[PDB]
Design a protein around this ligand. Structure first.
Ligand SMILES: Nc1ncnc2c1ncn2[C@@H]1O[C@H](COP(=O)(O)OP(=O)(O)O)[C@@H](O)[C@H]1O
Ligand SMILES: Nc1ncnc2c1ncn2[C@@H]1O[C@H](COP(=O)(O)OP(=O)(O)O)[C@@H](O)[C@H]1O
Ligand SMILES: Nc1ncnc2c1ncn2[C@@H]1O[C@H](COP(=O)(O)OP(=O)(O)O)[C@@H](O)[C@H]1O
Ligand SMILES: [Mg+2]
Ligand SMILES: [Mg+2]
Ligand SMILES: [Mg+2]
Lengths: 50, 56, 154, 351, 278, 528, 523
């Protein structure tokens, strides 16, 4: 996320419906891109999200 | 100055606070003679009590 | 005491009682003004001045000499700009009238309370022969209104 | 991650910091030897903001301890939780200021501020990206106020756009421990105004009147007052130290809390924490100025400052800007304007 | 001191409806400054301010003084509580920040375009605004007490302004609301400084400066002088005087002791005691 | 008198104040007299915390003894003022003050007013200054004379073996940072200390040593031929001065803004990388960045991916020193970056000592700034060596700044005493007595020296005065035979400004002390 | 219970109050009377902060003492009023007040009312003033030798007399450099433009007065020049950096390019600011606020030297010296506000510390005084002595009159009053003479400090003043003989004597009117 304070500002209903699906799709794309290189184990020094 | 002296002192007997406020009133209304009025009032009170000790 | 600086005698006084505020606009609902360009900063001040001046001119149009303003503890009932304008029109201003003696005042001098500028008409005013502040020698000041054309039973 | 270093100056500052760090360490599982024996790793998500990790597993606080007299460091080292600090972070002189603002700001401070600035450089070199400073001091002393203010100015020069917060104690209304307290307080507020983002004014008598009546049992010394102040500071900084439903550093509180830059003084509270921009500050300053003038009109104790290098007009400028601050605070209420001076003369004629 | 007091009281007589004249004492300022002997106390035909000039770059003597009295602070403008600034286009930021520093300037010029030399203010004056007075060659005094401003404005013929707005939408400053004084000086007295305004033209005014050995002495003299001022005021207002030293008490005692005989009751004793107590 | 007004006051009247002052001055000199000379003894000082300090310096000893006296405070302040200007001569000052007061008391106790002795002091001071103005020796100030002066000033703090090591370093550094004008500027000699490798390894480096290293694991530890870039521009995440916040719509906008918020620093890093590629085309030379502000892990990663060594938060004064040593330009912005701004260094490397890191910059062309590297096994050892180094540097600088140097070992004091004894017949009145007193005080410097070497004061002093009376050679004490020796030929040299300042200060303070009538403590006990 | 009327107030009345007041005044006078004349001895005092004051000045002694009796407080206050009004004579006023109060209890104990004594003292003060004005001597202020003589005669009593010919010169120069006439006809010798800087070390003979000013500052960046020959100086009251406003400003951004854009505009701001300075082509920039690093970069590119965080007082003195004026907005900077009256700017090291000198001014109206010496206490005493000397010089410049010293004026006035008193009748004749004979305590004290026979010297001097023209005879305070002040050359300004007599007599009048004391009345 951004270092400066950031807020998700919505003005219509469709954005409100689509936000969570957008986040989930982005996270899936990132994980699959990492996995496609052949890595079997990931080691991190911070929090892991659900 | 009678008013200043009586204002700077601390008093608690009501019969003396009456005279202190008398001096303050004399200062406010006129601005002079704030020492003579206390003397006059005290002497009047004393001479009246001398009569009231007799059955007057 | 009178908030006006200079006027202490009114002969043939016309008196009105006010229950609204001569200040900047403020809706009972949460309001705020957003500025995003440099012209709006001057425009806000100009419109504020015009808004106050309009109310003062409306008050003057009816012939009022003495104004009574009831106490308000949520918004300012009389700002410096309004007081300056009222002084420029030779109107004596008295503020901070308690909320519990309004009935006595209305019964005495025959005023009718006004809670809206649209209802400030020449028929809601009372008439008195003299309105003036007196100064006791050292104990302070006082304000007397005497010679009411329509006297109540007080 | 966005580290903060903490600076303590003076006897009162040292006493408060020694308990602030004690009450922080028990929250994160640190031991008086520096090791860690906590259970929940939620304590380690934001541990690096206040502790620097050394080789071998120890954690050392990001703290610098400063005073002009070696009396208080000996107590701090000999006291509880006084052996986790870095031994090279103790800076002290040999004489002391003796409750003189001028000596702290001009004579004795100038030959020691360089050591503090050389220690903060090494403490800042070890953090990836610092975000600000914490300062604890007093307004009624010589080392706490004058030297602390000089240090604030120097830090502001060296570090341009980093945040700065202070936790300053203030003189009490009906009791003044020092004869020259108004002078020190007035001369320190002048440069607290323009060199800090927020100030957390703490009063001694107000918090002192809680142990007798609310705590139901005390005849105490500075002791538990200090512990209560430390608890207040921990309740303030829990947002920085811990993650929650909505975490926010002190800047993210200030931006919502400070609309106008120069009105940045607060009054705390505690209900087991409350922080408020109550304008009851305007009552405190109105008192201090009231004392200042009363002494300055008589030129009392002035030669003790003039001999150190200060000029007579510095007091005049300080009091002028104190009056400016008081008027700026007063212009926000429009209700205290009703209490104008009662008119005494009788000239109320034509106009 | 009797001559000083009589002159000071006569200098304050005001012109009422003319039914009766009035003498508003305590409109004459009294200032204390220890130093020379008490015979060096001075009466000033004008007014004296316990204030100093705003900046050390200003002039400290004006020969023909045009005075403008103000009742508001000359500082860079800030929007009120209701108004706030929200920026979505960065290009519009800079022009905003200039305006805050320009509005107040546009006011000062309006005051200085009419030839005003001395400006008195009950509020503060920013250091950014002192430079305009410094360049124009003018004196500015800040943090003036309200009552002093009222007395100065009444004496010199000026008009007190809490704002520049007129009966239209705009702000103007006219030359008809300026007072005129024949001299304005900054004087030095025993290591401090104060301001003299001499020979005001609308009305006569007075002030007194009291010199003494130390502060206790000067305070006692001020308290003493107040009594004489009040006595002279009472004598002028009511045209009657009475002897002193005890003539009144003796005469009243004799008269009341004689008059008590006619009552012939128990009030006779009380009247006699009143006479003896006098 | 003051007791009737303040019952709690403390007073000391005419004959008691003088006794108090004399007693305290003698008490101070009785302790400080064991330091004088190369044969003085060493003191150990332990504070409340338990830290240990071994010392022989007069100023340190004065400021670390547990004393509460007013006139002791006066004398300590005088010693501090002498030290801060000259840096040498803080024991002789106290000794001469004490002896002057004792000699004055010797005559005052016989019914003589102190003003006569004061006038005698003034006349004797003028005569002594005139004599010192003609004893001095002017020379070229070559390397050998400076070696002699530095060694003389250093053998009184450390033993001979370490003094022979410190002398060369001090003289070489002072000669290295000197121009033929523009008087010598210290602060161009950095004193760094490392705790290992027993102190005979103290050295001089014609470069710089910095107490911090590279913060990325993938940076090169040794560079053989390097360009030096010195800057104080910030490569940290920076925010707008005015309040600001991000308002996005979904995840993709959030990502766009996240990558957008870094360009202001990526531009600076790209400027540095472009300059490095332009200058160091082939991977044969090096590039080193010394910064006074912070550097992010992102910027560290970007720089290290190219082969750049970067240091963050160097000290402010180094901003000058590097520019005088490496020979570049210290810059605040990157909008004009060019190859003239770069300096050159012939070796850059790193050394790890326990928990700490050091960086060495060496092999510069003509460095105008050098470093004195202190070494030793303890901490008090390093502190003592640091004090000795300060004394030596000040001595050499004062020798160069003046065009003259004065013979030592006490010869000049004997000469002044003999010259003053024959001047007192000319003056009139009882003031002669005062002159006599002054002369005797000037003999406190030779006596103590002899008494520190195990000889007898009076017979050795008589032997010294036997010469300089038949052969006018400037003769002083030989601290291993007790026989007179010609100080100049042996190689014992003293500074001229030190002696002049010492005479002035001692006379002024003794004169002001002798005229104190009564001591008063009648004010507020505490400022509370 | 405890029936009371005044809550533990303590009241005293009667003759005991008068005796106590007089005794307290005499006790105050007794502490000081050993410090009058050229043979005075010093006193060392300890303040509540641990310092030391080794001094000889009467006010410096009295203001360091805590006391309870109100009469002592009145005496201390009159001492400080004398110090503030004229700057000299704070010892003789205390002794004179003590003597005049001492010679009154003799009449108070002989059933004489205080008002008679008050009237007699007030009558005698006027004759004292007239006789003082009668024997005055005018002085020509364009003769430098006479002014040096007056200053020397003023400082032969203090500790810097050993360097008198030095100090005198210093003082004179300083005053002559601050006398200043401006709009109108108001002339001033204000002493807030003559700053005294003390640097321990060196020798006292190196003290001097600079034609310029001296500050404890250094260049902001090392590459700035430390030696400029004929600089042009601009003085700023503002900060050369980007700051926040006060109108509750916030920014909301949604586009990628805005953030960086904003961060650029700040820098652009700085640039134009610097340009508005470079358009005037100066060499030195002095500001009371901070300076940003980007501004330093631009100024160095323009070959400028910058200093930061100078005090307002120092900026005012620099403006008065070099001839510039202070500016707070660079956009309104003109050519008339650039100071071109300086002649050198140098930056030196004085004992491991950097100092900035602005010297060789064409015609400065402000100066600085640089003192060197053994330690802090000696320099503090030298500072006090220099203050005394400069105040005396200002007094003589504002009122060119002189009266003899050494006790000639006291004996002349006493003889005049004694001769005048034999033309009066009534009781007031006896107090009227008393004050006259109270003026002889000044010569007597001098004799006692010299170590001579007061009983014979005083009567010889009294016999000498009886003759027709011997108004200038006095006591030589160093040997103990009678000598004419014409040849010895001890003259003092008339203002000091007038103030001394007035303050002493008025203090006696004030203290003679008390009759009772009330204490502990809770404000
Ligand atoms: N010259 C005088 N001769 C006789 N009596 C006087 C004289 N002056 C004042 N008095 C008397 O003094 C009294 C006033 O005393 P004062 O101390 O002024 O106190 P106050 O007037 O406040 O009572 C008056 O009654 C007056 O008769
Ligand atoms: N080799 C030597 N032989 C004789 N005297 C010496 C020798 N070395 C130093 N001195 C004397 O020692 C004195 C200085 O002693 P020191 O302990 O350095 O104290 P300080 O220099 O602080 O007075 C000088 O007067 C010098 O003459
Ligand atoms: N050489 C002198 N011979 C005789 N009297 C002197 C001499 N010098 C000064 N005085 C006298 O000493 C007095 C000054 O006293 P001093 O001790 O300087 O303190 P102060 O000036 O505060 O009284 C003057 O009245 C002067 O007449
Ligand atoms: Mg009366
Ligand atoms: Mg030595
Ligand atoms: Mg004198």
């Amino acid at each position: 996320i951004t270092e400066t304070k950031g807020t998700v500002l919505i003005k219509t209903a469709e954005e409100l419906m689509n936000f969570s699906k957008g986040e989930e799709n982005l996270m899936d794309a990132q994980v699959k891109a990492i996995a496609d290189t052949g890595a079997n184990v990931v080691v991190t020094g911070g929090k892991v999200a659900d | 100055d009678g008013a200043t002296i009586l204002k700077l002192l601390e008093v608690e007997h009501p019969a003396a606070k009456v005279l202190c406020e008398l001096a303050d009133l004399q200062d406010k209304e006129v601005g002079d003679g704030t020492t003579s009025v206390v003397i006059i009032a005290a002497e009047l009170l004393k001479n009246a009590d001398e009569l009231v000790k007799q059955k007057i | 005491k009178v908030s006006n600086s200079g006027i202490t005698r009114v002969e043939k006084a016309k008196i009105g009682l006010i229950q609204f505020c001569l200040s900047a606009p403020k809706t009972d609902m949460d309001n705020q003004i957003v500025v995003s360009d440099y012209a709006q900063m001057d425009r806000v001040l100009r419109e504020e001045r015009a808004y106050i001046l309009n109310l003062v001119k409306q008050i003057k149009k009816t012939g009022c000499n003495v104004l009574l303003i009831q106490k308000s503890i949520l918004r300012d009932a009389l700002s410096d700009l309004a007081l300056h304008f009222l002084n420029k029109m030779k109107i004596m201003v008295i503020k901070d009238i308690e909320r519990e003696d309004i009935e006595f005042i209305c019964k005495t001098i025959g005023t009718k309370p006004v809670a809206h500028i649209d209802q400030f008409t020449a028929d809601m005013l009372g008439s008195a022969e003299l309105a003036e502040e007196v100064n006791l020698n050292g104990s302070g000041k006082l304000l007397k209104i005497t010679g009411c054309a329509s006297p109540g039973k007080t | 991650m966005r580290e903060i270093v903490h600076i303590q100056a003076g006897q009162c500052g040292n006493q408060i910091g020694a308990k602030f760090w004690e009450v922080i360490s028990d929250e994160h599982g640190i031991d008086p030897t520096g090791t860690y024996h906590g259970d929940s790793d939620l304590q380690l998500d934001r541990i690096s903001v206040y502790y620097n990790e050394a080789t071998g597993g120890k954690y050392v606080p990001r703290a610098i301890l400063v005073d002009l007299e070696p009396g208080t460091m000996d107590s701090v080292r000999s006291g509880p939780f006084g052996q986790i600090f870095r031994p090279d972070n103790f800076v002290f002189g040999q004489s002391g200021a003796g409750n003189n603002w001028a000596k702290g700001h001009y004579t004795e401070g100038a030959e020691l501020v360089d050591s503090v600035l050389d220690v903060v450089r090494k403490e800042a070199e070890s953090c990836d990206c610092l975000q600000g400073f914490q300062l604890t001091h007093s307004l009624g002393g010589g080392t706490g106020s004058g030297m602390g203010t000089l240090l604030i100015s120097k830090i502001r020069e060296e570090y341009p756009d980093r945040i700065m917060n202070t936790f300053s104690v203030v003189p009490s209304p009906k009791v003044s421990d020092t004869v020259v307290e108004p002078y020190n307080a007035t001369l320190s507020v002048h440069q607290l105004v323009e060199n800090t983002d927020e100030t957390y004014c703490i009063d001694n008598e107000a918090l002192y009147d809680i142990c007798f009546r609310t705590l139901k049992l005390t005849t105490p010394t500075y002791g538990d007052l200090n512990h209560l102040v430390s608890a207040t500071m921990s309740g303030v900084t829990t947002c920085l130290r811990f993650p929650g439903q909505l975490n926010a550093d002190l800047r993210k509180l200030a931006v919502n809390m400070v609309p106008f830059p120069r009105l940045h003084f607060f009054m705390p509270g505690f209900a087991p924490t409350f922080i408020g921009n109550s304008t009851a500050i305007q009552e405190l300053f109105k008192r201090i100025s009231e004392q200042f003038t009363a002494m300055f009109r008589r030129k009392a104790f002035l030669h003790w400052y003039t001999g150190e290098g200060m000029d007579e007009m510095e007091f005049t400028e300080a009091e002028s800007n104190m009056n400016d601050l008081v008027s700026e605070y007063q212009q926000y209420q429009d209700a205290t304007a009703e209490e104008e001076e009662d008119f005494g003369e009788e000239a109320e004629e034509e106009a | 001191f009797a001559n000083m007091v009589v002159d000071a009281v006569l200098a304050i007589k005001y012109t009422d409806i003319r039914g009766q004249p009035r003498y508003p004492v305590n409109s004459v300022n009294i200032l204390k400054a220890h130093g020379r002997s008490q015979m060096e106390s001075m009466l000033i035909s004008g007014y004296a301010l316990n204030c100093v000039v705003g900046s050390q770059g200003m002039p400290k003597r004006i020969v023909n003084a045009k005075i403008a009295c103000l009742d508001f602070s000359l500082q860079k403008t800030k929007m009120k509580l209701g108004v706030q600034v929200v920026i979505t286009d960065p290009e519009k930021l800079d022009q905003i920040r200039q305006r805050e520093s320009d509005i107040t300037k546009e006011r000062i010029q309006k005051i200085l375009a009419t030839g005003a030399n001395v400006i008195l203010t009950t509020g503060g004056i920013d250091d950014m605004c002192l430079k305009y007075f410094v360049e124009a060659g003018a004196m500015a005094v800040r943090r003036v007490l309200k009552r002093d401003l009222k007395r100065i404005a009444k004496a010199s013929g000026a008009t007190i302004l809490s704002t520049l707005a007129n009966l239209e939408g705009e702000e103007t400053f006219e030359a008809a609301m300026l007072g005129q004084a024949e001299e304005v000086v900054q004087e030095r007295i025993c290591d401090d400084e104060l301001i003299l305004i001499k020979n005001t033209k609308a009305r006569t005014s007075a002030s007194i400066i009291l010199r003494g050995a130390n502060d206790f002495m000067c305070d006692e003299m001020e308290r003493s002088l107040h009594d004489a001022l009040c006595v002279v005021k009472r004598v002028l207002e009511s045209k009657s005087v009475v002897p002193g030293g005890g003539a009144v008490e003796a005469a009243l005692s004799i008269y009341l002791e004689n008059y008590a005989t006619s009552m012939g009751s128990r009030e006779q004793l009380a009247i006699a005691e009143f006479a003896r107590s006098l | 008198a003051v007791k009737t007004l303040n019952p709690k006051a403390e007073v000391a009247r005419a004959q008691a104040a003088l006794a108090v002052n004399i007693s305290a001055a003698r008490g101070l000199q009785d302790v400080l007299r064991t330091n004088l000379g190369p044969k003085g003894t060493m003191k150990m000082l332990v504070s409340g915390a338990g830290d240990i300090k071994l010392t022989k310096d007069g100023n340190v000893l004065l400021h670390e003894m547990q004393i509460q006296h007013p006139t002791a405070s006066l004398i300590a302040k005088v010693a501090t003022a002498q030290d801060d200007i000259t840096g040498d001569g803080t024991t002789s000052n106290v000794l001469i003050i004490g002896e002057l007061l004792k000699q004055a008391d010797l005559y005052i106790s016989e019914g003589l007013h102190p003003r006569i002795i004061t006038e005698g002091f003034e006349a004797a001071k003028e005569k002594a200054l005139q004599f010192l103005e003609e004893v001095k020796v002017s020379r070229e100030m070559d390397r050998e004379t400076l070696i002699d002066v530095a060694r003389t000033s250093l053998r009184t703090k450390v033993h001979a073996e370490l003094a022979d090591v410190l002398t060369e370093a001090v003289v070489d550094s002072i000669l290295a940072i000197k121009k033929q004008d523009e008087p010598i500027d210290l602060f161009m000699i950095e004193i760094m200390e490392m705790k290992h490798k027993s102190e005979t390894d103290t050295s001089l480096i014609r470069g710089l040593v910095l107490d911090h290293g590279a913060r990325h694991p993938d940076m090169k530890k040794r560079v053989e031929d390097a360009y030096i870039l010195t800057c104080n521009v910030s490569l940290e995440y920076e925010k707008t001065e005015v309040n600001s916040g991000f308002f996005y719509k979904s995840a993709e906008e959030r990502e766009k803004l996240v990558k957008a918020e870094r360009k202001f620093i990526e531009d600076r890093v790209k400027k540095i990388i472009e300059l490095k590629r332009k200058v160091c085309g082939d991977s044969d030379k090096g590039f080193v960045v010394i910064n006074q502000k912070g550097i992010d892990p992102f910027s560290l990663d970007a720089l290290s991916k190219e082969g750049i060594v970067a240091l963050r938060r160097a000290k402010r004064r180094n901003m000058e020193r590097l520019t005088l040593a490496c020979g570049g330009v210290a810059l605040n912005s990157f909008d004009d970056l060019s190859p003239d701004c770069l300096g050159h260094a012939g070796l850059v490397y790193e050394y790890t000592l326990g928990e700490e890191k050091f960086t060495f910059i060496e092999k510069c062309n003509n460095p105008r700034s050098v470093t004195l590297l202190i070494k030793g096994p303890n901490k008090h050892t390093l502190t003592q060596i640091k004090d000795a180094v300060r004394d030596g540097l000040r001595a050499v600088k004062n020798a160069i700044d003046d065009g003259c140097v004065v013979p030592g070992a006490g010869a000049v004091e004997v000469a002044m005493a003999e010259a003053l004894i024959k001047h007192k017949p000319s003056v009139k009145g009882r003031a002669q007595l005062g002159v006599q007193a002054f002369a005797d005080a000037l003999l406190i410097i030779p006596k103590v020296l002899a008494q520190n070497s195990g000889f007898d004061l009076q017979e050795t002093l008589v032997k010294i005065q036997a010469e300089h009376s038949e052969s006018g050679q400037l003769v002083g004490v030989d601290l291993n035979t007790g026989e007179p020796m010609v100080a100049a030929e042996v190689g014992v040299w003293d500074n001229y400004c030190v002696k002049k300042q010492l005479l002035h200060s001692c006379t002024v303070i003794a004169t002001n002390i002798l005229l104190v009538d009564e001591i008063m403590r009648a004010g507020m006990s505490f400022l509370k | 219970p405890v029936l009371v009327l005044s809550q533990n107030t303590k009241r005293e009345s009667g003759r005991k109050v008068q005796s106590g007041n007089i005794n307290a005044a005499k006790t105050i006078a007794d502490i000081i009377r050993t410090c009058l004349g050229p043979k005075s001895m010093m006193k060392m005092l300890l303040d509540p902060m641990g310092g030391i004051v080794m001094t000889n000045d009467g006010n410096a002694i009295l203001r360091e003492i805590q006391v309870q009796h109100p009469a002592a407080k009145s005496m201390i206050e009159i001492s400080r009023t004398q110090d503030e009004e004229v700057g000299d004579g704070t010892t003789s006023v205390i002794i004179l007040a003590g003597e005049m109060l001492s010679v009154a209890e003799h009449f108070l104990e002989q059933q004489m009312h205080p008002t008679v004594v008050i009237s007699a003292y007030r009558k005698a003060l006027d004759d004292m003033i007239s006789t003082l004005k009668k024997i005055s001597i005018p002085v020509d202020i364009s003769d430098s030798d006479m002014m040096l003589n007056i200053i020397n005669s003023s400082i032969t009593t203090k500790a810097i007399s050993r360097w008198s010919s030095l100090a005198c010169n210093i003082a004179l120069d300083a005053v002559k450099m601050v006398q200043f006439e401006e709009n109108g006809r108001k002339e001033i010798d204000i002493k807030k433009y003559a700053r005294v800087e003390k640097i321990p070390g060196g020798i006292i003979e190196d003290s001097c007065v600079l034609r310029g000013v001296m500050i404890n500052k250094d260049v902001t960046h090392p590459r700035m020049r430390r030696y400029i020959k004929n600089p042009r100086i601009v003085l700023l009251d503002s900060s050369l950096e980007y700051k926040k406003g006060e109108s509750q400003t916030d920014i909301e951004i949604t586009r990628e390019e805005d953030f960086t854009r904003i961060l650029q505009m700040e820098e652009e701001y700085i640039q134009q600011l610097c340009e508005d300075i470079i358009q005037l082509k100066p060499d030195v920039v002095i500001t009371e606020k901070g300076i940003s690093d980007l501004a330093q970069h631009y100024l160095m590119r323009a070959n400028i030297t910058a200093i930061r965080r100078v005090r307002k007082t120092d900026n005012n003195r620099i403006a008065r010296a070099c001839g510039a004026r202070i500016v707070s907005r660079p956009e309104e900077l003109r050519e008339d506000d650039v100071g071109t009256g300086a002649g050198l700017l140098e930056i030196k090291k004085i004992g491991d510390e950097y100092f900035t000198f602005i010297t060789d001014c064409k015609d400065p109206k402000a100066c600085t005084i640089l003192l060197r010496g053994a330690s802090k206490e000696i320099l503090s005493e030298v500072e006090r002595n220099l203050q005394d000397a400069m105040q005396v010089c200002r007094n003589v410049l504002l009122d060119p009159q002189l009266v003899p010293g050494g006790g000639a004026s006291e004996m002349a006035v006493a003889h005049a009053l004694t001769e005048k008193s034999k033309a009066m009748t009534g009781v007031e004749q006896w107090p009227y003479r008393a004050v006259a004979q109270a003026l002889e305590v000044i010569p007597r004290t001098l004799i006692q400090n010299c170590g001579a026979s007061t009983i014979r010297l005083l009567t010889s001097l009294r016999a000498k003043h009886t003759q027709e023209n011997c108004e200038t005879w006095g006591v030589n305070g160093e040997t103990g003989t009678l000598v004419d002040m014409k040849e010895l050359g001890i003259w003092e300004p008339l203002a000091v004597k007038l103030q001394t007599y007035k303050t002493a007599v008025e203090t006696a009048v004030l203290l003679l009117r008390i009759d009772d004391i009330v204490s502990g009345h809770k404000k």
